[PDB]
Amino acid sequence: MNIFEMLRIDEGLRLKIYKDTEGYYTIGIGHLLTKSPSLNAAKSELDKAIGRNTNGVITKDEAEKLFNQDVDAAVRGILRNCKLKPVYDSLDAVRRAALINMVFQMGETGVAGFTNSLRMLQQKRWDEAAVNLAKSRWYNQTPNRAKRVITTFRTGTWDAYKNL
Ligand SMILES: *SCC1=CC(C)(C)N(O)C1(C)C
Ligand SMILES: [Cl-]
Ligand SMILES: [Cl-]
Numbered sequence: 001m002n003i004f005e006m007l008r009i010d011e012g013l014r015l016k017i018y019k020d021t022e023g024y025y026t027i028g029i030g031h032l033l034t035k036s037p038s039l040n041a042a043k044s045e046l047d048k049a050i051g052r053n054t055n056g057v058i059t060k061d062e063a064e065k066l067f068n069q070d071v072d073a074a075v076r077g078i079l080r081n082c083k084l085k086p087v088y089d090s091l092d093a094v095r096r097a098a099l100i101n102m103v104f105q106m107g108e109t110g111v112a113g114f115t116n117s118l119r120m121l122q123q124k125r126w127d128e129a130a131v132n133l134a135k136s137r138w139y140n141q142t143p144n145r146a147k148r149v150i151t152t153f154r155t156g157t158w159d160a161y162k163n164l
């Protein structure tokens, strides 16, 4: 298991434009296109992202390219953020993956907002961090995925992702 396999499980793979859990146009492995309710706006973002006239459909290779860029962006974002960087640096490789997962799903600014959870993670108070993380819109709206990510922070193992 690694961050790519982890996010591939959590995000799935779809080669045509679809709506994500929030109802936003997305494609590939959780590549958000736009929050606009306009499909045409989403198709324009897609064409721009891929570099060709796609008409809403991409190849597996193209999906994987966006995915690589997005994972890279999530990590880069953590390292540039003054709230996220110290937490990330303090963590082991497995828990680092859990933090990248959150950033991929909700964005740098969103995760940076979890001030109390971040402090508990920095303190290595794993059970306490896990309890705090669950008190969130994130957990309530995507409880199965949140549970997996939280288990990863609690245990520092891939237990929530094996057999998946
Ligand atoms: S405080 C984190 C941080 C972000 C960035 C602007 C990339 N930096 O140069 C430092 C390490 C200060
Ligand atoms: Cl709490
Ligand atoms: Cl709550």
Ligand SMILES: [Cl-]
Pocket (backbone or CB within 6 Å): 141, 142, 143, 144, 145, 146
């Ligand atoms: Cl879920």
